Amino acid sequence: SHSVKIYDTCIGCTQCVRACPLDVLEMVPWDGCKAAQIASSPRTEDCVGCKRCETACPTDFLSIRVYLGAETTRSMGLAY
């Protein structure tokens, strides 16, 4: 399964989760930013690695990072 990490430059704009087509990420309470929220990746077993989240990120170089890893039926996006 791919790895998804969220670093402390997160502004909590929620576009991470809004872009995910597989519900890997969540908005969880935090205190580092004004929005009092941060992105989390509790369900990376369903991640396919399309990179939509990072495409949505505004911070100067991403606060969310997807590193493709061990390929499974789910991560390869297989319907068969």
């Binding site: 990179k51 990072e54 170089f61 590193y67 890893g69 061990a70 390929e71 499974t72 390869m76 068969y80």
Partner: protein, 731 residues
């Protein structure tokens, strides 16, 4: 679906798709990323693999010797090496018909046969071998040597005999042994063989295992070497009318320095060759006494590196000893770069200064050797830069190399890459401009309006070595010069060999050579640009500041931040491979067209038509295909049939690679989804199900496989053309 293979990566072995197999093949030799790999186990597995690889080399050489001795015509080809075609091995193919059987029953053989272009007959003959018995004995001995190295590799995987990491990192001792023993003692042994077998056997004196202990290579024994005077070993050198393999005009000398070419064999003098090997043996032995080991005297490489600082270079070479000795990728890059340099050197020297008897007259083998070695050198250079990039990805420590030369190179990488880009643009614009100007000016019927730049620099250089054609009269070309008034024993022979337009020694050059040299400069600079920019941005750029976290090779970083295809340093290697092939194409086209003109006595064709690109297109490529493409015909078949078939085969493989290079993955994965659906819903075929899920090839895999096809087609197409054209004209 638990799946063992590959046992070194659980990530791959858990992949439920066909990818698992492909990647299993593609990552087996990347020991560093195996599950549980240590540094010591890494060095040890690499040691055993080295032993196995050396054994493979010895077995390949055994096969060459054995097939020449079994199915060849070595002994016949010795009788008349200028009119008999040397034989590689026998053909056995049930697909053949009568036409091909008759066409390949050649070179005087009674069965189908291939003509050898490896130059191996000339090599074995100049060595001193003259019978199939000696070749067979050498082949069997190499069988035994390969066995020895296979056993050594096996033995050094056993617990007691596994060398330690400190032993692998003992750089000073290994350098002493490789300079003194591997280089020096071996060169001394080859000087000894030449003096004992090659030189006598060239004079009708059979010297073998059954008499070499009793027949001195010189009438005056070793005492002249032990007492004082060595000029006796220069004695009476072989006269200009020496007939190779006979006593006619033969002498007794063993070490000479008369330079030039043996008049009959048109190659370097055997005595000069043995003397060279002896001298460089002494030098390499002395070199192997520089670094300390177990006796206090000697040098510490760490000290020498830490002692070469600089007022304008910061920390100099400090800590480069550990930087190099801790990175197998740094050392491998050094090795591949130096090896590619010396392979190109081999190529540029063996065609100009051949050392094997009657090989300068074998045009197909000479062309094939030059092309072969230059291609090998190009591959080596690309690999050296690839592994420099891999070093930066995996091994570079910025705090240990802080402010030293490595980090400082990294610190102005923008300037390096930018100026490489500038000189690339310079060369490209202006060389293409001159070529296209010449094309248009000749096309419109005014060939006198071309821009024909005389290559005065290289001509002046040739003049510095005695070449009096251009009339510069500088240094060696000037008899009044102090470089000529030295009394050197090699000057007369060197001048006679360089001032005769019958060899390849410093071939005459004109504007076509100028233009193609600037094309070569463009190709070298562009390939270096791709490789260096990949290496320096391997750890990061403004598009990917964290690229080192992703590894040397990876598909991309997605359509975001503008799009990031071919963003990795592996991708830079892949892109530079095309420019490597292009540069080699220009280089080898150059060599072959010029040597065709030279061998045929018509240098004017190249001199007059190489200045415009239609000249290459028509007089070189288009013309020299006529026999090639006629290897098989509606009217019959001849001995060039195999090369015509291989020519078309190389075209087909090249074009197939284009598919993997242009069409990308998603299109294929969706098509394969339709095909998967069809299989699941077809009765009878239903009974069968796949063990691995079929999926399209991966992004990186597509680049690799497309490049592999492209390169295979490139090499086979050009080899077919080169071989067939040169053997149809002169073979």
């Amino acid at each position: 679906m638990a799946t063992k293979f590959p046992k070194f990566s659980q990530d791959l072995a858990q992949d439920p798709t066909t990818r698992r197999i492909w990647y299993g093949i593609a990552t087996a030799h990347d020991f560093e990323t195996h599950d549980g790999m240590t540094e010591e186990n890494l060095y040890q597995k690499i040691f055993a693999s080295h032993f196995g690889h050396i054994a493979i080399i010895f077995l390949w050489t055994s096969g060459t010797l054995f097939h020449v001795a079994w199915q060849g015509n070595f002994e016949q080809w010795i009788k008349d090496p200028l009119n008999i075609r040397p034989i590689a091995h026998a053909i056995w193919d049930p697909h053949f018909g009568e036409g091909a059987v008759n066409a390949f029953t050649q070179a005087g053989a009674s069965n189908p046969v291939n003509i050898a272009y490896s130059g191996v007959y000339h090599w074995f003959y100049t060595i001193g071998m003259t019978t199939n018995q000696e070749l067979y004995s050498g082949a069997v001995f190499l069988l035994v040597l390969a066995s020895l190295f296979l056993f050594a590799g096996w033995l050094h995987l056993q617990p007691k005999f596994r060398p330690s990491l400190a032993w692998f990192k003992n750089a000073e001792s290994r350098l002493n042994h490789h300079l003194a023993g591997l280089f020096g003692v071996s060169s001394l042994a080859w000087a000894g063989h030449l003096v004992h077998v090659a030189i006598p056997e060239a004079r009708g004196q059979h010297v073998g295992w059954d008499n070499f202990l009793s027949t001195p290579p010189h009438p005056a024994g070793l005492m002249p070497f032990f007492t004082g005077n060595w000029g006796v070993y220069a004695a009476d050198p072989d006269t200009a009318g020496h007939i190779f393999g006979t006593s006619e005009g033969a002498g007794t000398a063993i070490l000479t320095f008369l330079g030039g070419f043996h008049p009959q064999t048109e190659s370097l003098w055997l005595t000069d060759i043995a003397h060279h090997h002896l001298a460089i043996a002494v030098i390499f032995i002395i070199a192997g006494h520089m670094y300390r080991t177990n006796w206090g005297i000697g040098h510490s490489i760490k000290e020498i590196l830490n002692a070469h600082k600089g007022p304008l270079t910061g920390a100099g070479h400090t800590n480069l000893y550990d930087t190099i000795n801790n990175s197998l990728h740094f050392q491998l890059g050094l090795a591949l770069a130096s090896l590619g340099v010396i392979t190109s050197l081999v190529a540029q020297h063996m065609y100009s200064l051949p050392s094997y008897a009657f090989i300068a007259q074998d045009h197909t083998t000479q062309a094939a050797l030059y092309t072969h070695h230059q291609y090998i050198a190009g591959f080596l250079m690309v690999g050296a830069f690839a592994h420099g990039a891999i070093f930066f990805v995996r091994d570079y420590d910025p705090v240990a190399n802080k402010d030293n030369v490595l980090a400082r190179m990294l610190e102005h990488k923008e300037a390096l890459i930018s100026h490489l880009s500038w000189v690339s643009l310079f060369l490209g614009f202006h060389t293409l401009g001159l070529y296209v100007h010449n094309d248009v000016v000749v096309a419109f019927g005014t060939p006198e309006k071309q821009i024909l730049i005389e290559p005065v620099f290289a001509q002046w250089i040739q003049a510095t070595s005695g070449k009096a054609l251009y009339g510069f009269d500088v240094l060696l070309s000037n008899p009044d010069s102090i470089a000529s008034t030295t009394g050197a024993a090699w000057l007369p022979g060197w001048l006679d060999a360089i001032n005769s337009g019958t060899n390849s020694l410093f071939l005459t050059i004109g504007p076509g050579d100028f233009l193609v040299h600037h094309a070569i400069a463009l190709g070298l600079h562009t390939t270096a640009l791709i490789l260096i920019k990949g290496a320096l941005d391997a750890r990061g750029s403004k598009l990917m500041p964290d690229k080192k976290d992703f590894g040397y090779s990876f598909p991309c970083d997605g359509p975001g931040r503008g799009g990031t295809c071919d963003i990795s340093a592996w991708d830079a290697f892949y892109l530079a491979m095309f420019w490597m092939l292009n540069t080699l194409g220009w280089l080898t086209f150059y060599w072959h067209w010029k040597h065709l003109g030279v061998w045929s006595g018509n240098v004017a064709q190249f001199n007059e038509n190489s200045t415009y690109l239609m000249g290459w297109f028509r007089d070189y490529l288009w013309a020299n295909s006529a026999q090639l493409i006629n290897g098989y015909n509606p009217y019959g078949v001849n001995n060039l049939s195999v090369w015509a078939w291989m020519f078309l085969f190389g075209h087909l493989v090249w074009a197939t690679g284009f598919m993997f290079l242009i069409s990308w993955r998603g299109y294929w994965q969706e098509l394969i989804e339709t095909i998967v659906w069809a299989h699941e819903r077809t009765p009878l075929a239903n009974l069968v199900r796949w063990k691995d899920k079929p999926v399209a090839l991966s992004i990186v895999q597509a680049r690799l496989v497309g490049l592999a096809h492209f390169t295979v087609g490139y090499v086979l197409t050009y080899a077919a053309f080169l071989i067939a054209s040169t053997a149809g004209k002169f073979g």
